[PDB]
Design a protein around this ligand. Structure first.
Ligand SMILES: *[C@@H]1O[C@H](CO)[C@@H](O[C@@H]2O[C@H](CO)[C@@H](O[C@@H]3O[C@H](CO[C@H]4O[C@H](CO)[C@@H](O)[C@H](O)[C@@H]4O)[C@@H](O)[C@H](O[C@H]4O[C@H](CO)[C@@H](O)[C@H](O)[C@@H]4O)[C@@H]3O)[C@H](O)[C@H]2NC(C)=O)[C@H](O)[C@H]1NC(C)=O
Ligand SMILES: *[C@@H]1O[C@H](CO)[C@@H](O[C@@H]2O[C@H](CO)[C@@H](O[C@@H]3O[C@H](CO[C@H]4O[C@H](CO)[C@@H](O)[C@H](O)[C@@H]4O)[C@@H](O)[C@H](O[C@H]4O[C@H](CO)[C@@H](O)[C@H](O)[C@@H]4O)[C@@H]3O)[C@H](O)[C@H]2NC(C)=O)[C@H](O)[C@H]1NC(C)=O
Lengths: 383, 220, 213
């Protein structure tokens, strides 16, 4: 289950019981899809009518295949921003090449690979002058084919985002093509039973890029996240301004510590990015390429905030800011100066009118929290 | 092996002051969160304080500006100093460790120690007078009959009872006390023993009552 | 604010699983713990973060805590489990127990007192005062009454009796003391300690002698 505790001195919330799922490295698997099977093609031309019209695709992406190779690649001369943004230099190995493994990769007989060779290794998956460039249609007896409606999307995914696909599609890496490709990942059998059961939260977290087109086949690279540490004790702090002391002045304070922390090693690694941490149920998916580390003498900061022991990361002011801050379970409220704050339910809009100070309200106690005329609705959702 | 021992209070007169101690084996102290939990005999448990190992400390409402919870962190002892002590405070006083969980927040009480009665009263410390109790002349019951010490008229509690030194274990029943009209405790001990061994084997009741600095051995 | 509250009484049929509730303020979902303390022992920790038993505790135990209320559940329910049970949690930064819950495992076999009555010691008399002894034991259930009779005409004056207490055996035990002037001792033929249990009544009796030892 999930627990939360409120610290009246720091006016902050600390929510515990999240089992962290942490990304460590990346499994890179290269699918290069060839054209086929076009082998059900008639022998004869006509300017009669159906389809093809997947030509403009094999151009449109071949077009921007140079755009990245020019506007980016040549012109090259916080997670995940840099990470896959940098992990392109995995492709500078893959592309700007000859085939490398290309044909010798899959060959016969498997569509799979054991290892991709290279300056480094990789997966190789797959499916399907005087070249094509074919022009025709003829009406004889028509069936579903010449759209496997699989590649056709791959471009609109690649082109609309300019070669870098923000997440892994169903048709970019097939459900079982992604499932099996999990089975080969370098950690354990523990994270597998999860990463398979969690599969969608991989794809949201993935990156993908186009190795090549040519005419030969369309070669793209799917990078996947891999989580090394499956179940770990991680927890999240939420803060609001703790102000005090009215003789007609105000002495105020704020925690700068939030919101996330986890410790695998253990060493306690803290995740300051508003992004980089996401919740599904109990589990918390965080990006290990974020940081930093701090000591396990961080812990103290919760208990006495004024500790000479490990001076805590805070903020001072004679300036109070009346504001609201939401928790995984309840919500914190700080009403200061001349302002007016209250709560409410779905069946009554104003139930209690809150004191001026820091005050904590669980989701049994209220739903609405009215701030001076912005309503915060009390979520089940975290920071 | 990890365990705690609390250093007795004994008897303290009301308006009193006194200071306990817990020293523990098998782990540091400033390492861990620790605290003090008291129980008045026969009733339930009451947390009276906690020590957060940063030096930071919180007290239960019922004692504040009275009790101070300390550390030597040299002798590896934990201190609770009690002041302006009052009748209600009379109780056992347990020391036990508080686990650290994962983040800084406190979790459970893993190990305790037997704890040592404070009795707070305005009254006279009185050690026991121990009279032995002779085995029945009748024979031979089960081949077995029953002898033991009687610890009489003693204050305040507790009173340890052994037999010989510890090597006599089984067969032993050391009764709970009785508070008297005079308000002085009394006690007993009894050993079921073979009549066949009597007169060969010899029995010493062994009594220690600390607050009266009274050690005694009676034969029997 | 916090105060926990749990029912001071629970019963169980032996082997049939049973369990106890501790509910206060918001336990939602607050970190619990569960203590078992048999008489005169320090209490030992049966379950902590929650429904999580520490190393070397029987797995017939386990917890549940959701919302208002936390509940400790015992699957096996053996009579060795008969005890006080306490639960605790944390608040502000400070702890809280609530003390209620004894258990029972019924019905135990009804068993009767084994009585040992001691006549006062030599040194005792030699100290110019005499105090008798009556020692009950290994009985059940735990309610009993004491009769003090001198020459089989009772006198209940000058006697201090305990209030019967349990023992590791999970049968009860208790003791009672007649105090006299030695002269009163010799001035009478016979002294009897009569305990009445179920109405089934066990009496052992002693009297002055010259014999050593
Ligand atoms: C693209 O090109 C390929 C190949 O030319 C097409 O694939 C063929 O598709 C058809 C239609 O479904 C298949 O026709 C089937 O042939 C079977 C016979 O071959 C069997 O031969 C022996 C036993 O005789 C078996 O060992 C072997 O396994 C084969 O099964 C039939 O079993 C099939 O079922 C039934 O067909 C008729 C029913 O009306 C009966 O006459 C049969 O007795 C039988 O019950 C079926 O006829 C054909 O096999 C496929 N060939 C190949 C190589 O794959 C694609 O269809 C085409 N794509 C498009 C869009 O047109
Ligand atoms: C979280 O952390 C803080 C600080 O560590 C604790 O709050 C207390 O804060 C003060 C100042 O920061 C701490 O330091 C001082 O302790 C002194 C001890 O008491 C004296 O008085 C008696 C009485 O006769 C003497 O017997 C005794 O030996 C001492 O000399 C005080 O003297 C200090 O006075 C301060 O006065 C002013 C403030 O008004 C300052 O300007 C001075 O510099 C001076 O420090 C002061 O109180 C104090 O130690 C802290 N408390 C404790 C128990 O250590 C919080 O207590 C802590 N959170 C919790 C729950 O304890």
């Amino acid at each position: 289950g999930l627990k939360e505790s409120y610290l009246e001195e720091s006016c902050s919330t600390i929510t515990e019981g999240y089992l962290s799922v942490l990304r460590t490295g990346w499994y890179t698997n290269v699918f290069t899809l060839e054209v086929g099977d076009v082998e059900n093609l008639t022998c004869t031309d006509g300017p009669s009518l159906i389809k093809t019209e997947l030509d403009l695709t094999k151009s449109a992406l071949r077009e921007l295949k140079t755009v990245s190779a020019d506007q980016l690649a040549r012109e090259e001369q916080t997670a995940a921003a840099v990470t896959a943004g940098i992990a392109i230099a995995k492709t500078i190995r893959l592309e700007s090449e000859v085939n490398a493994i290309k044909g010798a990769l899959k060959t016969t007989n498997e569509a799979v690979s054991t290892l991709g060779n290279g300056v480094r290794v990789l997966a190789t998956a797959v499916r399907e002058n005087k070249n094509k460039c074919d022009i025709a249609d003829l009406k004889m007896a028509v069936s579903f084919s010449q759209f496997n409606r699989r590649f056709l999307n791959v471009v609109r995914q690649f082109s609309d985002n300019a070669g870098i696909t923000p997440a892994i599609s169903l048709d970019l890496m097939t459900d079982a093509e992604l499932a099996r490709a999990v089975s080969y990942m370098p950690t354990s059998a523990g994270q597998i039973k999860l990463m398979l059961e969690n599969r969608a939260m991989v794809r949201r977290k993935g990156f993908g890029i186009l190795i090549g087109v040519y005419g030969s086949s369309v070669i793209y690279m799917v990078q996947l996240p891999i989580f090394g540490v499956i179940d770990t004790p991680c927890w999240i702090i939420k803060a609001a301004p703790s102000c005090s002391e009215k003789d007609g002045n105000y002495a105020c304070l704020l925690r700068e510590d939030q919101g996330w922390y986890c410790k695998n090693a253990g060493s306690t690694v803290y995740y300051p990015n508003d992004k980089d941490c996401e919740t599904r149920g109990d589990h918390v998916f965080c990006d290990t390429a974020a940081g930093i580390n701090v000591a396990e003498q961080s812990r103290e900061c919760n208990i006495n905030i004024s500790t000479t022991n490990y001076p805590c990361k805070v903020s001072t002011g004679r300036h109070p800011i009346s504001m609201v801050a939401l928790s995984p379970l309840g919500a914190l409220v700080a009403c200061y100066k001349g302002v007016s704050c209250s709560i409410g339910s779905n069946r009554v809009g104003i139930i209690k009118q809150l004191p001026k100070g820091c005050s904590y309200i669980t989701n049994q106690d209220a739903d609405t929290v009215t701030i001076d005329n912005t309503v915060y609705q009390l979520s089940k959702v975290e920071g | 092996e990890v365990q705690l021992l609390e250093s007795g209070g004994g008897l303290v007169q009301p308006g009193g002051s006194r200071r306990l101690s817990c020293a523990a084996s098998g782990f540091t102290v400033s390492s861990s969160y620790m605290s003090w939990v008291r129980q008045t005999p026969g009733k339930g448990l009451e947390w009276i304080s906690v020590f957060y190992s940063g030096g930071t400390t919180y007290y239960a409402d019922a004692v504040k500006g009275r009790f101070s919870i300390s550390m030597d962190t040299s002798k590896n002892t934990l201190h609770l100093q009690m002041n302006s002590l009052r009748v209600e405070d009379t109780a056992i006083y347990y020391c036990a460790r508080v686990l650290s969980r994962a983040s800084g927040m406190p979790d459970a009480f893993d190990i305790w120690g037997p704890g040592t009665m404070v009795t707070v009263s305005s009254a006279s410390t009185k050690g026991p007078s121990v009279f032995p109790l002779a085995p029945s002349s009748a024979a031979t019951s089960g081949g077995t009959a029953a002898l033991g010490c009687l610890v009489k008229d003693y204050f305040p509690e507790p009173v340890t009872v052994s037999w010989n030194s510890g090597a006599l274990t089984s067969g032993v029943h050391t009764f709970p006390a009785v508070l008297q009209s005079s308000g002085l405790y009394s006690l007993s001990s009894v050993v079921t023993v073979p009549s066949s061994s009597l007169g060969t084997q010899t029995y010493i009741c062994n009594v220690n009552h600390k607050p009266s600095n009274t050690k005694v051995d009676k034969k029997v | 604010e916090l105060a926990l509250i749990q029912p001071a009484s629970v019963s169980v049929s032996p082997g049939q699983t049973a369990s106890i509730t501790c509910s206060g303020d918001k336990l939602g979902d607050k970190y619990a713990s569960w203590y078992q303390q048999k008489p005169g022992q320090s209490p030992v920790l049966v379950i902590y973060q929650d429904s999580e038993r520490p190393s070397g505790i029987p797995e017939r135990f386990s917890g549940s805590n959701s919302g208002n209320t936390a509940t400790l559940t015992i699957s096996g329910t053996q009579a060795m489990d008969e005890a006080d049970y306490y639960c605790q949690a944390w608040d502000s930064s400070t702890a809280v127990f609530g003390g209620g819950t004894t258990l029972t495992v019924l019905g135990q076999p009804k068993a009767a007192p084994s009585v040992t009555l001691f006549p006062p010691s030599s040194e005792e008399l030699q100290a110019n005062k005499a105090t008798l002894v009556c020692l009950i034991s290994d009985f059940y259930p735990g309610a009993v009454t004491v009769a003090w009779k001198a020459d089989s005409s009772p006198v209940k004056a000058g006697v201090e009796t305990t209030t019967p207490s349990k023992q590791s055996n999970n049968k009860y035990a208790a003791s009672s003391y007649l105090s006299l002037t030695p002269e009163q001792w010799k001035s009478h033929r016979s002294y009897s300690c009569q305990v009445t249990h179920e109405g089934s009544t066990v009496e052992k009796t002693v009297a002055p002698t010259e014999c050593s030892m």
